[PDB]
Amino acid sequence: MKAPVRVAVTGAAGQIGYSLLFRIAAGEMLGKDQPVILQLLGSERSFQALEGVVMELEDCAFPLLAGLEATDDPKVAFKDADYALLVGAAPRKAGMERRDLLQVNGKIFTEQGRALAEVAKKDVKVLVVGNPANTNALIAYKNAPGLNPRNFTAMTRLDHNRAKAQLAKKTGTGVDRIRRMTVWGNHSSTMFPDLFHAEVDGRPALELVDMEWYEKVFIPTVAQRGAAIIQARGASSAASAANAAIEHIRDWALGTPEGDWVSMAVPSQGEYGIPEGIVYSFPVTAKDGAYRVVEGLEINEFARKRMEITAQELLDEMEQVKALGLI
Amino acid sequence: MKAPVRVAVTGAAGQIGYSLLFRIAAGEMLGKDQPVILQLLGSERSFQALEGVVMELEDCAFPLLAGLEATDDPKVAFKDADYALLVGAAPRKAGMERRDLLQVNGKIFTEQGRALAEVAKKDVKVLVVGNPANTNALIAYKNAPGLNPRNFTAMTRLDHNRAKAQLAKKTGTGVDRIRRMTVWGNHSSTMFPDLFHAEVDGRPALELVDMEWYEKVFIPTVAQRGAAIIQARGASSAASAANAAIEHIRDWALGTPEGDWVSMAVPSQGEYGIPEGIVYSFPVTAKDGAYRVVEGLEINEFARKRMEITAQELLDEMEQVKALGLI
């Protein structure tokens, strides 16, 4: 009954894309009643591999996959897109410094941001996954004049889910009973997982775990989780990252649970004193495809300091890209 | 909420497993209201990676994942299992042999068949994915006396879905409008995709495509599809194979659509004159953990010829296993 929506996904032939596309086509991201048109973006280098991915999607005989098109042209992949998941980013070449990567990503997201403004739906929902996520998202929306900046977001949902998982583990409770988890700031080592407002079966988390565990165990473990996966599997967390991207888009479009909220890095508008413009992760609720930062939360010294530290790191990142003339 | 069911999966640290486990934990295989307990089996060699997969699963914060346990012991992995997906098989060390391959797989599936018979639920539903699937299934159930042999099956659902995909592409219609596809026999080069009973939008397939295309294009393309993915991606079709596995179990546990059917390789009981005992893919309808071969279908010469060829291949494999004393 519902008309198909167009979903653009970049970095489609990569690891996250391989763990992402099938579940999207299965209807897990936008609903089992919502047909999707997959517009996949790849590079000339990985286009042959992308055709391989297209074949596997076809071989799943998905009833909701109403369209499937692979391309190496952003203007084609983003054409009339209702959703755009920017997973592709600059590769980690040997002898490629931080700044070297910075300018490569600068070109990618400047180009893609401009492509989106030119050919995608004006209300296209954008999620940046490719790192550095928050800053790449900044580059994109700044280069997407004509489009709503708040429609440009970055993913901290994996950090968010990792925090919920750790809290559930420690308390010996179902993760389905963990609510109001928050990861503030940058998707980086300075991220701040907040337990001051989190609840386990309705009870304040800090009534079940102590401050020492929270500070010396919980925070570092959530921050190092990505490395833990690599050290164990010998590969990055593609499947769980894909799951996080799906939930980020899903909750944004279909809405968050009553009494709960999720983490989303979005363009700051001064909430909690966070500098404007930078893409900062905040606790947010969503409804009808729009989200709202959860304000009014009490922020103690412990939280404030960590929130400011990650905010400063983001300001610094913005400073760098701005000096490069990217924005 | 239904009582949790235990799902055992072997070769859990491999490619298909990485594409399979998350969707199962998401409830895509047994329903959104069916909690699942994942019992993962991994060899001593891949256990470190398996622990990494466990972490990623935890990091998805799946509400339906009521349990998660990794082990290298089949008797632990299969304990009280309601379902067992046998994905792990044997490699092919540089310079091996056919009769040699049967030896390694013979030990694997004899052990797992015995483990299932000893610790799994009496009505455990088993699907063999690791190749050679049909023969591995035969070895497994032969070594699981006491357990219903019909509960042991092999996967041809990927061939089935690939066939539906090709027909849909050729006729230019939605794959969702493709029904009554059948893949008979062995999951091998002798597999027989049947178009004589398939319908496209309620219309017989052979009315939209001719025998020339069927024999010269359709059959070879479906048979070579696995190689095509490898040649394009540089990796096997893990995602589409995982999807096929999920659908095989799903349509078996829940049920096939009204007026339609699916392909499942199951122990033959003489249907269509196929030798008893061998695990042969048949067109089948299913409901609540029980399936029935769709008998009474008109089988023309073109079909029987190919049905007999693949049946003979399976007989020879059975004779080989028998000569080795595996069954």
Q: Which of B57, B232, B239 sits opposite A22 (nearest CB)?
A: B239
**Residue A81 domain boundaries:** 2-154
Task: Note whether B248 and B291 are same-domain residues.
Answer: yes
User: Does B232 contact chain A (CB < 8 Å)?
Assistant: yes
The residue in chain A having the minimum alpha-carbon distance to the alpha carbon of residue B177 is A63
Q: Which of B154, B177, B194 is the last residue of a domain?
A: B154
Closest C-alpha to B90, from B27, B20, B16, B11 = B11
Residue A237: its chain B contacts at CB < 8 A? 56, 59
Residue B169: its chain A contacts at CB < 8 A? 58
Query: Which one-letter DSSP state was computed for residue B256?
Result: P
Q: A18 and B243: CB-CB below 8 Å?
A: no
Alpha helices in B198-261 (DSSP H): 211-213, 219-233, 238-253
User: Does B61 contact chain A (CB < 8 Å)?
Assistant: yes
Please list, in sequence order, all residues whose beta carbon lies within 8 angstroms of the beta carbon of residue A5, skipping any fewer than 6 positions away: A30, A34, A35, A36, A37, A82, A83
CATH number at residue A79: 3.40.50.720
Task: Note whether A311 and A194 are same-domain residues.
Answer: yes
Q: Which of B154, B176, B205 is the last residue of a domain?
A: B154
Q: B175 and A58: CB-CB below 8 Å?
A: yes
* Three-state SS at B311: helix
Q: A49 and B234: CB-CB below 8 Å?
A: yes
Closest C-alpha to A38, from A7, A16, A77, A82 = A7
Write b or e for each residue in B197-207: b if 16 or more Cβ atoms lie within 10 A of its Cβ, otherwise e: bbbbeeeebee
Q: A59 and B234: CB-CB below 8 Å?
A: no
Q: Which of B56, B62, B240 sits opposite A60 (nearest CB)?
A: B240
Say how many domains are in chain B. Answer: 2
Task: Note whether A284 and A207 are same-domain residues.
Answer: yes
Instruction: Residue count of chain A, please give it.
Output: 327
Residue A228: its chain B contacts at CB < 8 A? 52, 55
Task: Note whether B165 and B144 are same-domain residues.
Answer: no
B163: left (phi over 0), alpha (psi -120 to 50) or beta: alpha
Closest C-alpha to B137, from B183, B92, B87 = B87
How was this structure obtained?
X-ray
Instruction: Residue count of chain B, please give it.
Output: 327
Q: Do A205 and A195 contact (CB within 8 A), yes or no? A: yes
Please list, in sequence order, all residues whose beta carbon lies within 8 angstroms of the beta carbon of residue A213, skipping any fewer than 6 positions away: A170
Q: Do A12 and A43 contact (CB within 8 A), yes or no? A: no
Residue A171: its chain B contacts at CB < 8 A? none
Query: Which one-letter DSSP state was computed for residue B145?
Result: T
Write b or e for each residue in A184-219: b if 16 or more Cβ atoms lie within 10 A of its Cβ, otherwise e: bbbbbebbbbbbbbbbbeeeebeebbeeeebeeebb
Q: Which of A55, A232, A244 sits opposite B55 (nearest CB)?
A: A232
A197 is catalytic: no
Evaluated on CA atoms B132, B135, B138, B143, the torsion sign reads negative
Task: Tell me the binding residues of A for substrate.
Answer: 92, 98, 131, 162
Report chain B's terminal Cα–Cα distance, integer Å: 41
Q: Which of A154, A182, A203 is the last residue of a domain?
A: A154
Evaluated on CA atoms A26, A28, A172, A177, the torsion sign reads negative
Task: Note whether A110 and A203 are same-domain residues.
Answer: no
* B112: its two tokens: 């797992």
Task: Note whether A48 and A30 are same-domain residues.
Answer: yes
CATH number at residue B188: 3.90.110.10
